[PDB]
């Protein structure tokens, strides 16, 4: 019988070289996930379909911002084979209320606050 | 529908064949052949 | 030096000009084009435009 797959905790134990390979900070974990649905939910289990629905990834190739908490990390682990996950980068910091209409999201994973100045 | 264990080698699914091909063993190949090496 | 079929790559070697000479040549070419534009010796112009 085909059922849900238990994922052992050993898989999510990062190696020292993984941080250098993927450009991650070994000390401070990132704050927000940018998730993009790559594959389709057809020919996939209904629980995976429901997870992708509750994660707000109905439209493929559209990034979505989520927290870095274990509550959503559990679902991200469940459907990790259908999404690409990147850390949100803020070179210019969090946009204020005066820059909400001038923000943009570059494909490299960073959020620019001042976009197209004049 | 065939049984789990058969005699005809039980030709696998295409995804399983791709997985086997990807996970095939790759021996370590040294840069210089040591036979004719000093 | 031994010369075999696979000893050398099967494509002619490419040599690029020096960066300073390339910059000087580009300056000369752009100056000539600007002079052509100023003199107005162009008859008809076509344009690829995104719209």
């Amino acid at each position: 019988k085909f059922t849900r797959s238990r994922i052992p905790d050993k898989v999510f134990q990062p190696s020292p070289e993984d941080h250098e390979k993927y450009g991650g900070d070994p000390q401070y974990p990132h704050k927000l996930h940018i998730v993009t649905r790559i594959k389709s939910t057809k020919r996939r289990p209904y629980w995976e379909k429901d997870i992708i629905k509750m994660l707000g990834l109905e439209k493929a190739h559209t990034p979505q911002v989520h927290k870095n908490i274990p509550s959503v990390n559990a679902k991200l682990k469940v459907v990790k084979h259908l999404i690409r996950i990147k850390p949100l980068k803020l070179p210019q910091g969090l946009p204020t209320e005066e820059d909400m209409a001038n923000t943009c999201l570059k494909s490299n994973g960073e959020l620019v606050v001042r976009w197209l100045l004049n | 529908g065939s049984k789990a264990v058969t005699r005809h080698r039980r030709v696998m699914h295409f995804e399983r064949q791709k997985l086997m091909a990807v996970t095939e063993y790759i021996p370590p190949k040294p840069t210089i052949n040591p036979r004719c090496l000093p | 030096v031994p010369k075999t079929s696979l000893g050398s790559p099967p494509w002619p070697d490419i040599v690029l000009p020096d960066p300073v000479e390339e910059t000087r040549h580009h300056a000369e070419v752009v100056g000539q084009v600007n002079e052509l534009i100023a003199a107005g010796r162009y008859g008809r112009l076509f344009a690829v435009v995104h719209f």
Binding site: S107, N108, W115, L116 | - | -
Partner: protein, 40 residues
């Protein structure tokens, strides 16, 4: 094509993504006054 090169350089995988070919106004009045903004 050429999506990987654009991704490495930081541009969108598709040239229509947040590039100047789409963000800028594609037309304007001959007098110079701004054109109405685009729905997209």
């Amino acid at each position: 094509a050429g999506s990987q090169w654009r991704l490495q350089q930081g541009f969108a995988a598709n040239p229509s993504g947040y590039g100047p070919l789409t963000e800028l106004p594609d037309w304007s009045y001959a007098d110079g006054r701004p054109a109405p903004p685009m729905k997209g």
